Design an enzyme around this catalytic site. Structure first.
Site, PDB file in Angstrom:
ATOM      1  N   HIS A 191      -2.957   6.474  10.202  1.00 29.49           N
ATOM      2  CA  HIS A 191      -2.515   5.101  10.491  1.00 29.49           C
ATOM      3  C   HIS A 191      -1.011   4.924  10.727  1.00 29.49           C
ATOM      4  CE1 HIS A 191      -6.488   3.625   9.762  1.00 29.49           C
ATOM      5  NE2 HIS A 191      -6.484   3.980   8.489  1.00 29.49           N
ATOM      6  N   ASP A 242     -13.119   9.743  10.265  1.00 30.89           N
ATOM      7  CA  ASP A 242     -12.807   8.838   9.156  1.00 30.89           C
ATOM      8  C   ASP A 242     -13.542   7.496   9.356  1.00 30.89           C
ATOM      9  OD1 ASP A 242     -10.217   8.455   6.991  1.00 30.89           O
ATOM     10  OD2 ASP A 242     -10.987   6.637   7.955  1.00 30.89           O
ATOM     11  N   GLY A 267      -1.403   1.459   6.257  1.00 27.14           N
ATOM     12  CA  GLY A 267      -2.676   1.866   5.677  1.00 27.14           C
ATOM     13  C   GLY A 267      -2.588   3.095   4.800  1.00 27.14           C
ATOM     14  N   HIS A 287     -12.310   4.641   9.196  1.00 27.67           N
ATOM     15  CA  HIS A 287     -11.396   3.709   9.874  1.00 27.67           C
ATOM     16  C   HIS A 287     -10.947   4.212  11.254  1.00 27.67           C
ATOM     17  CE1 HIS A 287     -11.068   2.711   5.518  1.00 27.67           C
ATOM     18  NE2 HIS A 287     -10.929   1.467   5.954  1.00 27.67           N
ATOM     19  N   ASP A 327       0.828  -1.213   0.000  1.00 27.94           N
ATOM     20  CA  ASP A 327       0.000   0.000   0.000  1.00 27.94           C
ATOM     21  C   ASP A 327       0.864   1.266   0.000  1.00 27.94           C
ATOM     22  OD1 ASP A 327      -0.035   0.738   3.339  1.00 27.94           O
ATOM     23  OD2 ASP A 327       0.387  -1.332   2.718  1.00 27.94           O
ATOM     24  N   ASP A 373     -14.465   8.831   3.563  1.00 30.54           N
ATOM     25  CA  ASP A 373     -14.798   7.472   3.146  1.00 30.54           C
ATOM     26  C   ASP A 373     -15.993   6.888   3.886  1.00 30.54           C
ATOM     27  OD1 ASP A 373     -13.152   7.324   5.436  1.00 30.54           O
ATOM     28  OD2 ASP A 373     -11.862   5.786   4.562  1.00 30.54           O
ATOM     29  N   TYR A 428     -12.369   7.831  -1.396  1.00 30.58           N
ATOM     30  CA  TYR A 428     -11.903   7.133  -2.590  1.00 30.58           C
ATOM     31  C   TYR A 428     -12.812   7.310  -3.800  1.00 30.58           C
ATOM     32  CZ  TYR A 428      -8.852   5.538   1.002  1.00 30.58           C
ATOM     33  OH  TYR A 428      -7.940   5.508   2.034  1.00 30.58           O
TER      34      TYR A 428
HETATM   35  O1  LIG Z   1      -8.534   5.254   4.084  1.00 29.88           O
HETATM   36  C1  LIG Z   1      -8.059   4.434   4.921  1.00 29.88           C
HETATM   37  N1  LIG Z   1      -7.872   4.802   6.330  1.00 29.88           N
HETATM   38  O2  LIG Z   1      -8.086   5.955   6.868  1.00 29.88           O
HETATM   39  C2  LIG Z   1      -7.744   2.987   4.560  1.00 29.88           C
HETATM   40  C3  LIG Z   1      -8.371   2.269   3.531  1.00 29.88           C
HETATM   41  C4  LIG Z   1      -8.034   0.911   3.307  1.00 29.88           C
HETATM   42  C5  LIG Z   1      -7.054   0.294   4.092  1.00 29.88           C
HETATM   43  C6  LIG Z   1      -6.684  -1.161   3.985  1.00 29.88           C
HETATM   44  C7  LIG Z   1      -7.789  -2.011   4.144  1.00 29.88           C
HETATM   45  C8  LIG Z   1      -7.640  -3.389   4.143  1.00 29.88           C
HETATM   46  C9  LIG Z   1      -6.376  -3.949   4.013  1.00 29.88           C
HETATM   47  C10 LIG Z   1      -5.238  -3.095   3.882  1.00 29.88           C
HETATM   48  C11 LIG Z   1      -3.951  -3.710   3.750  1.00 29.88           C
HETATM   49  C12 LIG Z   1      -2.817  -2.925   3.624  1.00 29.88           C
HETATM   50  C13 LIG Z   1      -2.939  -1.544   3.630  1.00 29.88           C
HETATM   51  C14 LIG Z   1      -4.205  -0.932   3.753  1.00 29.88           C
HETATM   52  C15 LIG Z   1      -5.372  -1.730   3.885  1.00 29.88           C
HETATM   53  C16 LIG Z   1      -6.459   1.013   5.141  1.00 29.88           C
HETATM   54  C17 LIG Z   1      -6.797   2.345   5.369  1.00 29.88           C
HETATM   55  K   LIG Z   2     -12.457   7.385  12.741  1.00 29.57           K
HETATM   56 ZN   LIG Z   3     -10.328   5.692   6.101  1.00 28.10          ZN
END
Ligand SMILES: O=C(NO)c1ccc(-c2cccc3ccccc23)cc1
Ligand SMILES: [K+]
Ligand SMILES: [Zn+2]
Length: 364
Positions: free
Chosen positions: A130, A165, A138, A167, A88, A254, A293
């Site tokens: 993150h 957010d 992330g 997440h 990522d 998101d 996104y």
């Molecule tokens: O906008 C995001 N956070 O604020 C976000 C979106 C998707 C993911 C994310 C989701 C699932 C698996 C992943 C595996 C490796 C890296 C990122 C991952 C992580 C973060």
């Molecule tokens: K949050």
């Molecule tokens: Zn997010």
């Protein structure tokens, strides 16, 4: 000191778009804000690049040096996995310069707040919540939210970080989970297998920071009213218990209907109400973006929220501008919620709120 600071330069926007992972997002966000002429009503501040020492306030020298090294050329480095790079977070071109630019922009906003230049300072390209002290995570190379909070700590004794957010803002919460100087409050989807996996309501912080972490685990399909009711209930109690002197607010889009994550079913109006509620405290407030996104919808959201900050009502029609063609099929600013169910059981939500109310009584 009246008008919000808007962190912006054409160079900063080009840099923020330069990796093309969420391609052209920063340009689309700024161009819509500009199309509505909101920038005219704001103090445009050029961001500075974060120095090594500023980045090191949170991140380890070993991590910063690695990031710097793989940034020189393309670079497969044997140490890259250890530092969270390669998936990522690929080790690309001036990845280090990108990171330092985003880190610097949030620090600049924070410094504006410290100097009393404004009461609200906006960096829509920040909010990378993150990232850890020694590891990208992330999609986050560097934790600009933490860097911003640590800059605010030069002046403010108690800082509230609010993370709306989709997440869990695990990176910021972990940074401050041992201290009572910073309280972190995250509303987020929480479900087994859903990233990052942490942030159940029982996550309350550790040691001296115990009860200074607040987590609100929410299920798929939540809409504006219910979300605001939860957010307002928690913030009212957090405000009373903690008496923050400064606020850092992450507004990752998101959660908004039509996002690829396809989890929450919010519109910018509901997030706007939460923002309104925080603005009324009249504290120094640092506004960050985050995830998001669906490009047009994210621009829609942050543009609308900028309007909320400025107290303006925006026309429903998307103004003719560079990216007008991306706003199909209705070409309006409003977002319609998706026709899918709200999976949140009202009594589960209430139990979570009660648990939080109980935790906040310990805050002294
Ligand atoms: O906008 C995001 N956070 O604020 C976000 C979106 C998707 C993911 C994310 C989701 C699932 C698996 C992943 C595996 C490796 C890296 C990122 C991952 C992580 C973060
Ligand atoms: K949050
Ligand atoms: Zn997010």
């Amino acid at each position: 000191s009246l008008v919000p600071v808007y962190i912006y330069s054409p160079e900063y926007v080009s840099m923020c778009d330069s990796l093309a992972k969420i391609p052209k997002r920063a340009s689309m966000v700024h161009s819509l804000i500009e199309a509505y002429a909101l920038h005219k009503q704001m103090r445009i501040v050029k961001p500075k690049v974060a120095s090594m020492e500023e980045m090191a306030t949170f991140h380890t020298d070993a991590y910063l040096q690695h990031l710097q090294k793989v940034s020189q050329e393309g670079d497969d480095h044997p140490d890259s996995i250890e530092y969270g790079l390669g998936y990522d977070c690929p080790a690309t071109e001036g990845i280090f310069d990108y990171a330092a630019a985003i880190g610097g922009a949030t620090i600049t906003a924070a410094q504006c707040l410290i100097d009393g230049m404004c009461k609200v300072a906006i960096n829509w390209s920040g909010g990378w919540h993150h990232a850890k002290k020694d590891e990208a995570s992330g999609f986050c190379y560097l934790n600009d939210a933490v860097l911003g909070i640590l800059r605010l700590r030069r002046k403010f004794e108690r800082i509230l970080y609010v993370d709306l957010d989709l997440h869990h803002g695990d990176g910021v919460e972990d940074a401050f989970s041992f201290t009572s100087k910073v309280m972190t409050v995250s509303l987020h989807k929480f479900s087994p297998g859903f990233f990052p996996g942490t942030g159940d309501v029982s996550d309350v912080g550790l040691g001296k920071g115990r009860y200074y972490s607040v987590n609100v685990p929410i299920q798929d399909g939540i809409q504006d009213e219910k979300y605001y009711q939860i957010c307002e209930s928690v913030l009212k109690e957090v405000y009373q218990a903690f008496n923050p002197k400064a606020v850092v607010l992450q507004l990752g889009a998101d959660t908004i209907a039509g996002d690829p994550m396809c989890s929450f079913n919010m519109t910018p109006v509901g997030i706007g109400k939460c923002l309104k509620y925080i603005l009324q405290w009249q504290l120094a407030t640092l506004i960050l973006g985050g995830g998001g996104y669906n490009l047009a919808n994210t621009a829609r959201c942050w543009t609308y929220l900028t309007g909320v900050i400025l107290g303006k009502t925006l026309s429903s029609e998307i103004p003719d501008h560079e990216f007008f063609t991306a706003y199909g099929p209705d070409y309006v600013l409003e977002i319609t919620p998706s026709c899918r169910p709200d999976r949140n059981e009202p009594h589960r939500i209430q139990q979570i709120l009660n648990y939080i109310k109980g935790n906040l009584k310990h805050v002294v």
